[PDB]
């Protein structure tokens, strides 16, 4: 097992209601323990672990460093958010809905239908199951939101059903990238 | 801890001693916007929409990483050469789209709780190692200051069993996670 020494720095911006409530927190991290941080709400560099006083007191003594860091709330956070407002925050990817049973089609043996809502952005989405236009409020097993990592998401909503006759099950998906809800049906 | 409608990471800086390894990346709402190739002095955006309407000076990444190399040599002196603690990674494999036994798809291998950021993620199809159609993301940051990496595999689902092989120092043996068409 070879030894490794890791150092990381995270200049994070927190946005709320747009650029109205914006908060900047820069984190100086040694290995896995963050030892020194600057907070825009606080206004100065703070030591987080005993590994930080020699660094927090030195960075507060220099006046060119405290003015450069306070201005980063405007030159980094609010400056980039105006660029996110025309590219990222406008990205809309329509979800692809698919219904298919897990176990093979049974005459009346219980089966579970998986409604896979895959590749959509952003993350806000609501899925509802309907048996003959009756909203199923019980027996719906939904998975947590899966982050694919390539700016897409996916969620699989399953229904514990029993295949009778006539039975027309529908999966209703609503998404901001959709003006009208997407519905996929499945008959017995 | 900090509630916000959107959380951005304008400066995910990373520098370690085990080799000249470094990383500069930006993140928005948990997704990676770009990463700077420190050896090529190149900003690599992670979306076709980003490459056309956004711009970032790659030289500012090398400036910030060069300070990390300095600041790393400072905390090693203060911490009396305290090395990193190897964490046990959690591996998960899933598909990008529903499997239809013939329709092209993409396998996703998410390797969570990675530390230190040194790992090999390779694919296996029926035992043999896959080399083509494999791409992975950079080290995405977590709230506990660890990392997670995601590897992709465009494949053809057939009635063929795939594996994700993760090599890390925190593990004793290479970890394999299984995935197969229902």
């Amino acid at each position: 097992s070879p030894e490794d020494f890791v150092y990381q720095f995270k200049g994070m911006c927190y946005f709320t209601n747009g650029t109205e409530r914006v908060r900047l927190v820069t984190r100086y991290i040694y290995n896995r323990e963050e030892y020194a941080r600057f907070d825009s709400d606080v206004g100065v560099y703070r030591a987080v672990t005993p590994l930080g006083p020699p660094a927090a007191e030195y960075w507060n003594s220099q006046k060119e460093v405290l003015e450069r860091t306070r201005a980063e709330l405007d030159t980094v956070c609010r400056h980039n958010y105006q660029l996110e407002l025309r590219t990222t925050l406008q990205r809309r990817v329509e979800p692809t809905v698919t219904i298919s049973p897990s176990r093979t089609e049974a005459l009346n043996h219980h089966n579970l239908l998986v409604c896979s809502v895959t590749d959509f952005y952003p993350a806000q989405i609501k899925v509802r199951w309907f048996r003959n236009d009756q909203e199923e409020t019980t027996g719906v097993v939904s998975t947590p939101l899966i982050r694919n990592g390539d700016w897409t998401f996916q969620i699989l909503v399953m229904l514990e059903m029993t295949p009778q006759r006539g039975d027309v099950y529908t999966c209703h998906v609503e998404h901001p990238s959709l003006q009208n809800p997407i519905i996929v049906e499945w008959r017995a | 801890d900090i509630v916000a409608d959107h959380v951005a990471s304008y400066g995910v800086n990373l520098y370690q001693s085990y080799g000249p390894s470094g990383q500069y990346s930006h993140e928005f709402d948990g997704d990676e916007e770009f990463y700077v190739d420190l050896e090529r002095k190149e900003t690599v955006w992670q979306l076709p929409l980003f490459r056309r309407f956004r711009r970032f000076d790659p030289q500012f990444a090398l400036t910030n990483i060069a300070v990390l190399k300095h600041n790393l040599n400072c905390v090693i002196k203060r911490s009396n050469s305290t090395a990193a603690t190897n964490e046990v990674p959690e591996v998960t494999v899933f598909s990008k789209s529903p499997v239809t036994l013939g329709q092209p798809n993409t396998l996703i291998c998410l390797v969570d709780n990675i530390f230190p950021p040194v790992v090999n993620i390779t694919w296996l199809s029926n035992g043999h190692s896959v080399t083509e159609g494999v791409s992975e993301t950079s080290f995405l940051s977590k709230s506990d200051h660890s990392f997670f990496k995601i590897s992709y595999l465009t494949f053809l689902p057939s009635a063929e069993i795939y594996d994700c092989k993760v090599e890390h120092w925190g593990l004793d043996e290479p970890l394999l996670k299984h995935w197969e068409p229902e």
Partner: peptide, 15 residues
């Protein structure tokens, strides 16, 4: 599309 920026890093006092 202006020039994007990010996290200005602070240098620590070491020999």
């Amino acid at each position: 599309g202006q020039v994007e920026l990010g996290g200005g890093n602070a240098v620590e006092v070491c020999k």
